[PDB]
CSV table of N, CA and C and ligand atoms in Angstrom, one decimal:
chain,number,residue,atom,x,y,z
V,9,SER,N,4.8,-27.8,26.8
V,9,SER,CA,5.7,-27.9,27.9
V,9,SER,C,5.1,-27.7,29.2
V,10,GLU,N,5.7,-28.1,30.3
V,10,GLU,CA,5.2,-27.8,31.7
V,10,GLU,C,5.0,-26.2,31.9
V,11,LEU,N,5.8,-25.4,31.3
V,11,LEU,CA,5.6,-24.0,31.4
V,11,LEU,C,4.4,-23.5,30.7
V,12,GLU,N,4.1,-24.0,29.5
V,12,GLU,CA,2.9,-23.6,28.7
V,12,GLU,C,1.7,-24.1,29.5
V,13,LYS,N,1.7,-25.3,30.1
V,13,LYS,CA,0.6,-25.9,30.8
V,13,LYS,C,0.4,-25.0,32.1
V,14,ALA,N,1.4,-24.5,32.6
V,14,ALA,CA,1.3,-23.6,33.8
V,14,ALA,C,0.6,-22.3,33.4
V,15,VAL,N,1.0,-21.7,32.3
V,15,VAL,CA,0.3,-20.5,31.8
V,15,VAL,C,-1.2,-20.8,31.5
V,16,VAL,N,-1.5,-21.9,30.9
V,16,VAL,CA,-2.9,-22.2,30.6
V,16,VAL,C,-3.7,-22.4,31.9
V,17,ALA,N,-3.1,-23.0,32.9
V,17,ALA,CA,-3.7,-23.2,34.2
V,17,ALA,C,-4.0,-21.9,34.9
V,18,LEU,N,-3.1,-20.9,34.8
V,18,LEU,CA,-3.4,-19.7,35.5
V,18,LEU,C,-4.6,-18.9,34.9
V,19,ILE,N,-4.7,-19.0,33.6
V,19,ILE,CA,-5.8,-18.4,32.8
V,19,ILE,C,-7.1,-19.1,33.2
V,20,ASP,N,-7.1,-20.4,33.2
V,20,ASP,CA,-8.2,-21.2,33.4
V,20,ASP,C,-8.8,-21.0,34.9
V,21,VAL,N,-7.9,-21.0,35.9
V,21,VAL,CA,-8.4,-20.9,37.3
V,21,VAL,C,-8.9,-19.5,37.5
V,22,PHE,N,-8.3,-18.5,36.9
V,22,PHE,CA,-8.8,-17.1,37.1
V,22,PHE,C,-10.2,-17.0,36.5
V,23,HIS,N,-10.4,-17.6,35.4
V,23,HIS,CA,-11.7,-17.5,34.7
V,23,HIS,C,-12.8,-18.4,35.4
V,24,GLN,N,-12.4,-19.5,35.9
V,24,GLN,CA,-13.4,-20.3,36.7
V,24,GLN,C,-14.0,-19.5,37.8
V,25,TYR,N,-13.1,-18.8,38.5
V,25,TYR,CA,-13.6,-18.1,39.7
V,25,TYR,C,-14.1,-16.7,39.4
V,26,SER,N,-13.5,-16.0,38.4
V,26,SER,CA,-14.0,-14.6,38.1
V,26,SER,C,-15.4,-14.7,37.5
V,27,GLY,N,-15.7,-15.8,36.8
V,27,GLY,CA,-17.0,-15.9,36.1
V,27,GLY,C,-18.2,-16.2,36.9
V,28,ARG,N,-18.0,-16.4,38.2
V,28,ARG,CA,-19.2,-16.8,39.1
V,28,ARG,C,-20.2,-15.8,39.2
V,29,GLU,N,-19.8,-14.6,39.6
V,29,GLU,CA,-20.8,-13.5,39.9
V,29,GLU,C,-20.3,-12.2,39.4
V,30,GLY,N,-21.2,-11.2,39.2
V,30,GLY,CA,-20.9,-9.9,38.9
V,30,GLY,C,-20.0,-9.8,37.6
V,31,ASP,N,-19.0,-9.0,37.6
V,31,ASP,CA,-18.1,-8.9,36.5
V,31,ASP,C,-17.5,-10.2,36.2
V,32,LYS,N,-17.7,-10.7,35.0
V,32,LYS,CA,-17.2,-12.1,34.7
V,32,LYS,C,-15.6,-12.1,34.5
V,33,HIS,N,-15.0,-10.9,34.5
V,33,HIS,CA,-13.5,-10.9,34.3
V,33,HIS,C,-12.8,-10.3,35.5
V,34,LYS,N,-13.5,-10.2,36.6
V,34,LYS,CA,-12.8,-9.8,37.9
V,34,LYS,C,-13.3,-10.7,39.0
V,35,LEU,N,-12.4,-10.8,40.0
V,35,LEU,CA,-12.8,-11.5,41.3
V,35,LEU,C,-13.3,-10.5,42.3
V,36,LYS,N,-14.5,-10.7,42.8
V,36,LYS,CA,-15.0,-10.0,43.9
V,36,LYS,C,-14.5,-10.7,45.2
V,37,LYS,N,-14.7,-10.1,46.4
V,37,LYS,CA,-14.2,-10.8,47.6
V,37,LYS,C,-14.6,-12.3,47.8
V,38,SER,N,-15.9,-12.6,47.6
V,38,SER,CA,-16.4,-14.0,47.7
V,38,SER,C,-15.7,-14.9,46.7
V,39,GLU,N,-15.4,-14.5,45.5
V,39,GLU,CA,-14.8,-15.3,44.5
V,39,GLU,C,-13.3,-15.5,44.9
V,40,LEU,N,-12.6,-14.5,45.3
V,40,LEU,CA,-11.2,-14.5,45.7
V,40,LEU,C,-11.1,-15.5,47.0
V,41,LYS,N,-12.0,-15.3,47.9
V,41,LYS,CA,-12.0,-16.2,49.1
V,41,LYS,C,-12.1,-17.7,48.7
V,42,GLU,N,-13.0,-18.0,47.8
V,42,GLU,CA,-13.1,-19.4,47.4
V,42,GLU,C,-11.9,-19.9,46.6
V,43,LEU,N,-11.3,-19.0,45.7
V,43,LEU,CA,-10.1,-19.4,45.0
V,43,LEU,C,-9.0,-19.8,46.0
V,44,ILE,N,-8.8,-18.9,47.0
V,44,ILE,CA,-7.7,-19.2,48.0
V,44,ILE,C,-8.0,-20.5,48.8
V,45,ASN,N,-9.2,-20.6,49.3
V,45,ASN,CA,-9.6,-21.8,50.1
V,45,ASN,C,-9.6,-23.1,49.3
V,46,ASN,N,-10.0,-23.1,48.1
V,46,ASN,CA,-10.1,-24.3,47.3
V,46,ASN,C,-8.9,-24.7,46.6
V,47,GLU,N,-8.1,-23.7,46.1
V,47,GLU,CA,-7.0,-23.9,45.2
V,47,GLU,C,-5.6,-23.6,45.8
V,48,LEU,N,-5.5,-23.0,46.9
V,48,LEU,CA,-4.2,-22.6,47.5
V,48,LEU,C,-4.0,-23.2,49.0
V,49,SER,N,-4.7,-24.3,49.2
V,49,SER,CA,-4.8,-24.8,50.6
V,49,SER,C,-3.4,-25.3,51.1
V,50,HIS,N,-2.5,-25.7,50.2
V,50,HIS,CA,-1.1,-26.0,50.6
V,50,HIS,C,-0.2,-24.8,50.9
V,51,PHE,N,-0.5,-23.6,50.4
V,51,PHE,CA,0.3,-22.4,50.5
V,51,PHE,C,-0.2,-21.4,51.4
V,52,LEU,N,-1.5,-21.3,51.6
V,52,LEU,CA,-2.1,-20.3,52.4
V,52,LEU,C,-3.1,-20.9,53.4
V,53,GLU,N,-3.1,-20.2,54.6
V,53,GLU,CA,-4.0,-20.6,55.7
V,53,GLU,C,-5.5,-20.4,55.2
V,54,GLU,N,-6.4,-21.3,55.5
V,54,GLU,CA,-7.8,-21.2,55.1
V,54,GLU,C,-8.3,-19.8,55.6
V,55,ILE,N,-9.0,-19.1,54.8
V,55,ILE,CA,-9.7,-17.9,55.2
V,55,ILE,C,-11.1,-18.1,55.8
V,56,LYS,N,-11.2,-17.8,57.1
V,56,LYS,CA,-12.4,-18.0,57.8
V,56,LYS,C,-13.0,-16.8,58.5
V,57,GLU,N,-12.5,-15.6,58.2
V,57,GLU,CA,-13.0,-14.4,58.9
V,57,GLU,C,-13.0,-13.3,57.8
V,58,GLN,N,-14.1,-12.5,57.9
V,58,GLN,CA,-14.3,-11.3,57.0
V,58,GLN,C,-13.1,-10.4,57.0
V,59,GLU,N,-12.5,-10.2,58.1
V,59,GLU,CA,-11.4,-9.3,58.3
V,59,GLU,C,-10.2,-9.7,57.4
V,60,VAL,N,-10.0,-11.0,57.3
V,60,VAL,CA,-8.9,-11.5,56.5
V,60,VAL,C,-9.2,-11.4,55.0
V,61,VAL,N,-10.5,-11.7,54.6
V,61,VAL,CA,-10.9,-11.5,53.2
V,61,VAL,C,-10.7,-10.0,52.8
V,62,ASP,N,-11.1,-9.1,53.7
V,62,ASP,CA,-11.0,-7.7,53.4
V,62,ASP,C,-9.6,-7.3,53.2
V,63,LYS,N,-8.7,-7.8,54.1
V,63,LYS,CA,-7.3,-7.3,54.1
V,63,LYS,C,-6.6,-7.9,52.9
V,64,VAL,N,-6.9,-9.1,52.5
V,64,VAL,CA,-6.3,-9.7,51.3
V,64,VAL,C,-6.7,-8.9,50.1
V,65,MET,N,-8.0,-8.6,49.9
V,65,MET,CA,-8.5,-7.8,48.8
V,65,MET,C,-7.8,-6.5,48.7
V,66,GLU,N,-7.8,-5.8,49.9
V,66,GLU,CA,-7.1,-4.5,50.0
V,66,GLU,C,-5.7,-4.5,49.5
V,67,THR,N,-5.0,-5.6,49.8
V,67,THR,CA,-3.6,-5.8,49.4
V,67,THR,C,-3.4,-6.0,47.9
V,68,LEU,N,-4.3,-6.8,47.3
V,68,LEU,CA,-4.2,-7.2,45.9
V,68,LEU,C,-4.8,-6.1,45.0
V,69,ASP,N,-5.8,-5.4,45.5
V,69,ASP,CA,-6.5,-4.4,44.6
V,69,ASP,C,-5.7,-3.1,44.4
V,70,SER,N,-4.7,-3.1,43.5
V,70,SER,CA,-3.8,-2.0,43.2
V,70,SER,C,-4.6,-0.8,42.6
V,71,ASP,N,-5.6,-1.0,41.8
V,71,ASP,CA,-6.3,0.1,41.1
V,71,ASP,C,-7.6,0.6,41.9
V,72,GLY,N,-7.8,0.0,43.1
V,72,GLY,CA,-8.9,0.5,44.0
V,72,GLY,C,-10.3,0.4,43.6
V,73,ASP,N,-10.7,-0.4,42.6
V,73,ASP,CA,-12.1,-0.7,42.3
V,73,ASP,C,-12.8,-1.7,43.2
V,74,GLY,N,-12.1,-2.3,44.2
V,74,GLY,CA,-12.6,-3.3,45.1
V,74,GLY,C,-12.7,-4.7,44.6
V,75,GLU,N,-12.1,-4.9,43.4
V,75,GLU,CA,-12.1,-6.3,42.8
V,75,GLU,C,-10.7,-6.6,42.3
V,76,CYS,N,-10.4,-7.9,42.1
V,76,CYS,CA,-9.1,-8.3,41.6
V,76,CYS,C,-9.2,-8.7,40.1
V,77,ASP,N,-8.6,-7.9,39.3
V,77,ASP,CA,-8.6,-8.2,37.8
V,77,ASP,C,-7.5,-9.1,37.5
V,78,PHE,N,-7.3,-9.4,36.2
V,78,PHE,CA,-6.3,-10.4,35.8
V,78,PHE,C,-4.9,-10.0,36.1
V,79,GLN,N,-4.6,-8.7,35.9
V,79,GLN,CA,-3.2,-8.3,36.2
V,79,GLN,C,-2.9,-8.3,37.7
V,80,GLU,N,-3.9,-8.0,38.5
V,80,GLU,CA,-3.8,-8.0,39.9
V,80,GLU,C,-3.6,-9.5,40.4
V,81,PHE,N,-4.3,-10.4,39.8
V,81,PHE,CA,-4.2,-11.8,40.1
V,81,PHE,C,-2.8,-12.3,39.8
V,82,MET,N,-2.3,-11.9,38.6
V,82,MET,CA,-0.9,-12.3,38.3
V,82,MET,C,0.1,-11.8,39.3
V,83,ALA,N,-0.1,-10.6,39.8
V,83,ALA,CA,0.8,-10.1,40.9
V,83,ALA,C,0.7,-10.9,42.2
V,84,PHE,N,-0.5,-11.3,42.5
V,84,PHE,CA,-0.7,-12.3,43.6
V,84,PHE,C,0.0,-13.6,43.4
V,85,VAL,N,-0.1,-14.2,42.2
V,85,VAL,CA,0.6,-15.4,41.9
V,85,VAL,C,2.1,-15.2,42.1
V,86,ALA,N,2.6,-14.1,41.6
V,86,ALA,CA,4.0,-13.8,41.7
V,86,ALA,C,4.4,-13.8,43.2
V,87,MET,N,3.5,-13.2,44.0
V,87,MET,CA,3.8,-13.2,45.5
V,87,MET,C,4.0,-14.6,46.1
V,88,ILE,N,3.0,-15.4,45.7
V,88,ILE,CA,2.9,-16.8,46.2
V,88,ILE,C,4.2,-17.6,45.7
V,89,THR,N,4.4,-17.4,44.4
V,89,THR,CA,5.5,-18.2,43.8
V,89,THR,C,6.9,-17.8,44.4
V,90,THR,N,7.0,-16.5,44.6
V,90,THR,CA,8.3,-16.0,45.2
V,90,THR,C,8.5,-16.5,46.7
V,91,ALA,N,7.4,-16.4,47.5
V,91,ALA,CA,7.4,-16.9,48.8
V,91,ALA,C,7.8,-18.4,48.9
V,92,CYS,N,7.4,-19.2,47.8
V,92,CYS,CA,7.7,-20.6,47.7
V,92,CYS,C,9.1,-20.8,47.3
V,93,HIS,N,9.6,-20.1,46.3
V,93,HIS,CA,11.0,-20.1,45.8
V,93,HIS,C,11.9,-19.7,46.9
V,94,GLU,N,11.4,-19.0,47.9
V,94,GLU,CA,12.3,-18.5,49.1
V,94,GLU,C,12.1,-19.2,50.4
V,95,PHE,N,11.0,-19.9,50.6
V,95,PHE,CA,10.8,-20.9,51.7
V,95,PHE,C,11.9,-21.8,51.6
V,96,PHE,N,12.3,-22.2,50.4
V,96,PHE,CA,13.6,-22.9,50.1
V,96,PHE,C,13.9,-22.9,48.6
U,5,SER,N,-3.8,-28.8,43.8
U,5,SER,CA,-4.7,-28.2,42.7
U,5,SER,C,-3.9,-27.9,41.4
U,6,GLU,N,-4.6,-27.7,40.3
U,6,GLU,CA,-3.9,-27.2,39.1
U,6,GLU,C,-3.1,-25.9,39.4
U,7,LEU,N,-3.7,-24.9,40.2
U,7,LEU,CA,-3.0,-23.7,40.5
U,7,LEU,C,-1.7,-24.0,41.3
U,8,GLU,N,-1.7,-24.9,42.3
U,8,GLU,CA,-0.5,-25.2,43.0
U,8,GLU,C,0.6,-25.9,42.1
U,9,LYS,N,0.1,-26.8,41.2
U,9,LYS,CA,1.0,-27.4,40.2
U,9,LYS,C,1.6,-26.4,39.3
U,10,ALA,N,0.8,-25.3,39.0
U,10,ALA,CA,1.4,-24.3,38.1
U,10,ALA,C,2.5,-23.5,38.8
U,11,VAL,N,2.2,-23.2,40.1
U,11,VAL,CA,3.2,-22.5,40.9
U,11,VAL,C,4.5,-23.4,41.0
U,12,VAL,N,4.4,-24.7,41.2
U,12,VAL,CA,5.6,-25.5,41.3
U,12,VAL,C,6.3,-25.6,40.0
U,13,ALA,N,5.5,-25.6,38.9
U,13,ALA,CA,6.2,-25.7,37.6
U,13,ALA,C,7.0,-24.4,37.2
U,14,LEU,N,6.5,-23.3,37.7
U,14,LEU,CA,7.2,-22.0,37.4
U,14,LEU,C,8.6,-22.0,38.1
U,15,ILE,N,8.5,-22.5,39.4
U,15,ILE,CA,9.8,-22.5,40.2
U,15,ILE,C,10.7,-23.5,39.5
U,16,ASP,N,10.2,-24.7,39.1
U,16,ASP,CA,11.0,-25.7,38.6
U,16,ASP,C,11.7,-25.3,37.3
U,17,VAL,N,10.9,-24.7,36.4
U,17,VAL,CA,11.5,-24.4,35.0
U,17,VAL,C,12.5,-23.3,35.2
U,18,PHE,N,12.3,-22.4,36.1
U,18,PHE,CA,13.3,-21.3,36.3
U,18,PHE,C,14.6,-21.9,36.8
U,19,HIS,N,14.5,-22.8,37.7
U,19,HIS,CA,15.7,-23.4,38.3
U,19,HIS,C,16.4,-24.3,37.4
U,20,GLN,N,15.7,-25.0,36.5
U,20,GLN,CA,16.3,-25.9,35.5
U,20,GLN,C,17.3,-25.1,34.6
U,21,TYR,N,16.8,-23.9,34.2
U,21,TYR,CA,17.5,-23.1,33.3
U,21,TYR,C,18.5,-22.2,33.9
U,22,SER,N,18.2,-21.6,35.1
U,22,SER,CA,19.1,-20.7,35.8
U,22,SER,C,20.3,-21.4,36.3
U,23,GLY,N,20.2,-22.7,36.6
U,23,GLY,CA,21.3,-23.5,37.2
U,23,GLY,C,22.4,-23.9,36.2
U,24,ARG,N,22.2,-23.7,34.9
U,24,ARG,CA,23.1,-24.2,33.9
U,24,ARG,C,24.5,-23.7,34.0
U,25,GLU,N,24.6,-22.3,34.0
U,25,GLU,CA,25.9,-21.6,34.0
U,25,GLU,C,25.9,-20.4,34.9
U,26,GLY,N,27.1,-20.0,35.3
U,26,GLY,CA,27.2,-18.7,36.1
U,26,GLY,C,26.4,-18.8,37.3
U,27,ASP,N,25.7,-17.6,37.6
U,27,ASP,CA,24.9,-17.5,38.8
U,27,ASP,C,23.8,-18.6,38.7
U,28,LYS,N,23.7,-19.5,39.7
U,28,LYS,CA,22.7,-20.6,39.6
U,28,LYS,C,21.3,-20.1,39.8
U,29,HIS,N,21.1,-18.8,40.3
U,29,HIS,CA,19.8,-18.3,40.5
U,29,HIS,C,19.4,-17.2,39.6
U,30,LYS,N,20.1,-17.0,38.5
U,30,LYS,CA,19.7,-16.0,37.5
U,30,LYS,C,19.9,-16.6,36.1
U,31,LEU,N,19.1,-16.1,35.2
U,31,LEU,CA,19.2,-16.5,33.7
U,31,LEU,C,20.1,-15.5,33.0
U,32,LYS,N,21.2,-16.0,32.5
U,32,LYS,CA,22.1,-15.2,31.5
U,32,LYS,C,21.4,-15.3,30.1
U,33,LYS,N,21.8,-14.5,29.2
U,33,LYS,CA,21.2,-14.6,27.8
U,33,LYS,C,21.1,-16.0,27.2
U,34,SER,N,22.1,-16.8,27.2
U,34,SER,CA,22.1,-18.1,26.7
U,34,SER,C,21.0,-19.0,27.4
U,35,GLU,N,20.9,-18.8,28.7
U,35,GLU,CA,19.9,-19.6,29.4
U,35,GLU,C,18.5,-19.2,29.1
U,36,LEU,N,18.2,-17.9,29.0
U,36,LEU,CA,16.9,-17.3,28.7
U,36,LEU,C,16.6,-17.7,27.2
U,37,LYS,N,17.5,-17.7,26.3
U,37,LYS,CA,17.3,-18.1,24.9
U,37,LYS,C,16.8,-19.5,24.9
U,38,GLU,N,17.5,-20.4,25.6
U,38,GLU,CA,17.0,-21.8,25.6
U,38,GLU,C,15.7,-22.1,26.2
U,39,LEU,N,15.4,-21.3,27.3
U,39,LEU,CA,14.1,-21.4,28.0
U,39,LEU,C,13.0,-21.1,27.0
U,40,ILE,N,13.1,-19.9,26.4
U,40,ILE,CA,12.1,-19.5,25.4
U,40,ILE,C,12.0,-20.5,24.2
U,41,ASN,N,13.1,-20.9,23.6
U,41,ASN,CA,13.0,-21.8,22.5
U,41,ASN,C,12.5,-23.2,22.8
U,42,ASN,N,12.8,-23.7,24.0
U,42,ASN,CA,12.5,-25.1,24.4
U,42,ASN,C,11.1,-25.2,25.0
U,43,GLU,N,10.8,-24.1,25.8
U,43,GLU,CA,9.6,-24.2,26.7
U,43,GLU,C,8.4,-23.3,26.3
U,44,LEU,N,8.7,-22.3,25.4
U,44,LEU,CA,7.6,-21.4,25.0
U,44,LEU,C,7.3,-21.4,23.5
U,45,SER,N,7.6,-22.5,22.8
U,45,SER,CA,7.5,-22.6,21.4
U,45,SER,C,6.1,-22.4,20.8
U,46,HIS,N,5.0,-22.6,21.6
U,46,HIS,CA,3.7,-22.3,21.2
U,46,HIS,C,3.3,-20.8,21.4
U,47,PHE,N,4.0,-20.1,22.2
U,47,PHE,CA,3.6,-18.7,22.5
U,47,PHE,C,4.5,-17.6,21.9
U,48,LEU,N,5.8,-18.0,21.6
U,48,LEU,CA,6.8,-17.1,21.1
U,48,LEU,C,7.5,-17.7,19.9
U,49,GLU,N,7.9,-16.8,19.0
U,49,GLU,CA,8.6,-17.1,17.8
U,49,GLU,C,10.0,-17.6,18.3
U,50,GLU,N,10.5,-18.7,17.7
U,50,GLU,CA,11.9,-19.2,18.0
U,50,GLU,C,12.9,-18.0,17.9
U,51,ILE,N,13.8,-17.9,18.8
U,51,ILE,CA,14.9,-16.9,18.8
U,51,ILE,C,16.1,-17.5,18.0
U,52,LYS,N,16.4,-16.8,16.9
U,52,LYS,CA,17.5,-17.3,16.0
U,52,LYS,C,18.6,-16.2,15.7
U,53,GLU,N,18.5,-15.0,16.4
U,53,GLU,CA,19.4,-13.9,16.1
U,53,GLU,C,19.8,-13.3,17.4
U,54,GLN,N,21.1,-13.0,17.5
U,54,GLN,CA,21.7,-12.3,18.7
U,54,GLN,C,20.9,-11.0,19.1
U,55,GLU,N,20.5,-10.3,18.1
U,55,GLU,CA,19.7,-9.0,18.2
U,55,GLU,C,18.5,-9.2,19.0
U,56,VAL,N,17.8,-10.3,18.8
U,56,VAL,CA,16.5,-10.6,19.4
U,56,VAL,C,16.8,-11.1,20.9
U,57,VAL,N,17.8,-11.9,21.1
U,57,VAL,CA,18.2,-12.3,22.4
U,57,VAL,C,18.5,-11.0,23.3
U,58,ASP,N,19.3,-10.1,22.7
U,58,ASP,CA,19.7,-8.9,23.4
U,58,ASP,C,18.5,-8.1,23.8
U,59,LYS,N,17.5,-7.9,22.8
U,59,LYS,CA,16.4,-7.1,23.1
U,59,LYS,C,15.5,-7.7,24.1
U,60,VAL,N,15.3,-9.0,24.1
U,60,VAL,CA,14.4,-9.7,25.1
U,60,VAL,C,15.1,-9.4,26.5
U,61,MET,N,16.4,-9.7,26.6
U,61,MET,CA,17.0,-9.5,27.9
U,61,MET,C,16.9,-8.1,28.4
U,62,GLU,N,17.2,-7.1,27.5
U,62,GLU,CA,17.1,-5.7,27.8
U,62,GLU,C,15.7,-5.3,28.4
U,63,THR,N,14.6,-5.9,27.8
U,63,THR,CA,13.3,-5.7,28.2
U,63,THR,C,13.0,-6.3,29.6
U,64,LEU,N,13.4,-7.5,29.8
U,64,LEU,CA,13.1,-8.2,31.1
U,64,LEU,C,14.0,-7.8,32.3
U,65,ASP,N,15.2,-7.3,32.0
U,65,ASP,CA,16.2,-6.9,33.0
U,65,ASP,C,15.9,-5.6,33.6
U,66,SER,N,14.9,-5.5,34.5
U,66,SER,CA,14.5,-4.3,35.2
U,66,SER,C,15.6,-3.7,36.1
U,67,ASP,N,16.4,-4.5,36.7
U,67,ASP,CA,17.5,-4.0,37.7
U,67,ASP,C,18.9,-3.8,37.0
U,68,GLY,N,18.9,-4.0,35.7
U,68,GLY,CA,20.1,-3.7,34.9
U,68,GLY,C,21.5,-4.4,35.1
U,69,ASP,N,21.4,-5.6,35.8
U,69,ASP,CA,22.6,-6.4,36.0
U,69,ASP,C,22.9,-7.3,34.8
U,70,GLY,N,22.1,-7.3,33.7
U,70,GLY,CA,22.4,-8.1,32.6
U,70,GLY,C,21.8,-9.5,32.6
U,71,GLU,N,21.1,-9.9,33.7
U,71,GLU,CA,20.6,-11.2,33.9
U,71,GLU,C,19.2,-11.1,34.3
U,72,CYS,N,18.4,-12.2,34.2
U,72,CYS,CA,17.0,-12.3,34.6
U,72,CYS,C,16.9,-13.1,35.9
U,73,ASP,N,16.6,-12.4,37.0
U,73,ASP,CA,16.4,-13.1,38.3
U,73,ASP,C,15.0,-13.6,38.4
U,74,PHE,N,14.7,-14.2,39.5
U,74,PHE,CA,13.3,-14.8,39.6
U,74,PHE,C,12.2,-13.8,39.5
U,75,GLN,N,12.3,-12.7,40.1
U,75,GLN,CA,11.3,-11.7,40.1
U,75,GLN,C,11.0,-11.2,38.7
U,76,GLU,N,12.1,-11.0,37.9
U,76,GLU,CA,12.1,-10.5,36.5
U,76,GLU,C,11.4,-11.6,35.7
U,77,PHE,N,11.7,-12.9,36.0
U,77,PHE,CA,11.1,-14.0,35.3
U,77,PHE,C,9.6,-14.0,35.5
U,78,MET,N,9.2,-13.9,36.8
U,78,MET,CA,7.7,-13.8,37.1
U,78,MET,C,7.1,-12.6,36.3
U,79,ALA,N,7.7,-11.5,36.1
U,79,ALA,CA,7.2,-10.4,35.3
U,79,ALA,C,7.0,-10.8,33.8
U,80,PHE,N,8.0,-11.5,33.3
U,80,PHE,CA,7.9,-12.1,32.0
U,80,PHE,C,6.7,-13.1,31.8
U,81,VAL,N,6.6,-14.0,32.8
U,81,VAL,CA,5.5,-15.0,32.8
U,81,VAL,C,4.2,-14.2,32.7
U,82,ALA,N,4.1,-13.1,33.6
U,82,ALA,CA,2.8,-12.3,33.6
U,82,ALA,C,2.6,-11.7,32.2
U,83,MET,N,3.6,-11.2,31.6
U,83,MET,CA,3.4,-10.7,30.2
U,83,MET,C,2.8,-11.7,29.2
U,84,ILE,N,3.4,-12.9,29.3
U,84,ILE,CA,3.0,-14.0,28.4
U,84,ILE,C,1.6,-14.4,28.7
U,85,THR,N,1.3,-14.6,30.0
U,85,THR,CA,0.0,-15.0,30.4
U,85,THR,C,-1.1,-14.0,30.0
U,86,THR,N,-0.8,-12.7,30.2
U,86,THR,CA,-1.7,-11.6,29.9
U,86,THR,C,-2.0,-11.6,28.3
U,87,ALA,N,-0.9,-11.7,27.5
U,87,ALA,CA,-1.0,-11.7,26.1
U,87,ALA,C,-1.9,-12.9,25.6
U,88,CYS,N,-1.9,-14.0,26.4
U,88,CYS,CA,-2.7,-15.2,26.1
U,88,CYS,C,-4.2,-15.0,26.5
U,89,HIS,N,-4.4,-14.5,27.7
U,89,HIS,CA,-5.7,-14.1,28.2
U,89,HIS,C,-6.4,-13.1,27.3
U,90,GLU,N,-5.6,-12.4,26.6
U,90,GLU,CA,-6.1,-11.3,25.7
U,90,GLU,C,-6.1,-11.6,24.2
U,91,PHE,N,-5.3,-12.6,23.7
U,91,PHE,CA,-5.5,-13.1,22.4
U,91,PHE,C,-6.9,-13.6,22.2
U,92,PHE,N,-7.5,-14.1,23.3
U,92,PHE,CA,-8.9,-14.4,23.5
U,92,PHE,C,-9.3,-14.7,24.9
P,27,CA,CA1,-16.7,-12.0,39.1
P,28,CA,CA1,-8.8,-4.0,41.0
P,29,CA,CA1,22.6,-19.1,35.5
P,30,CA,CA1,18.3,-8.5,36.4
């Protein structure tokens, strides 16, 4: 179904980016920056300043280890999706 | 991107099902049952008993109004996606 394909896509995109550097199952700041800039260009302003990268990570990093894990990424997707469902 | 397409798909599937009966922005039990059976057949056992419908709704309905709203649906998707990311 389209829903199953959506679930597969969320897993795949997280792993494409999380696997680049360091912990292969978490997004460091550089990985999260590239994910947003490359994959969310219709929904979010391009990130071009360290201050914005820092603030985004600070927001998403609920457990405070400085990285975005899969559960934190799902919370981010839920934010984006809700903002879209409510833009209209 | 595939991520943007995934976000659009989550909004679309919720609205296809939520719009059938009653509140057009929430899933009642019958709507949630059909969503799971029709759209999540690879990830979840088909629901064939009232007891299972009831228990699923009870689990997803965080705010206790007896229906699944968009935020509760996103939490459900996060459950499914995490179970999949961890099946392997
Ligand atoms: Ca990483
Ligand atoms: Ca974290
Ligand atoms: Ca409804
Ligand atoms: Ca509810």
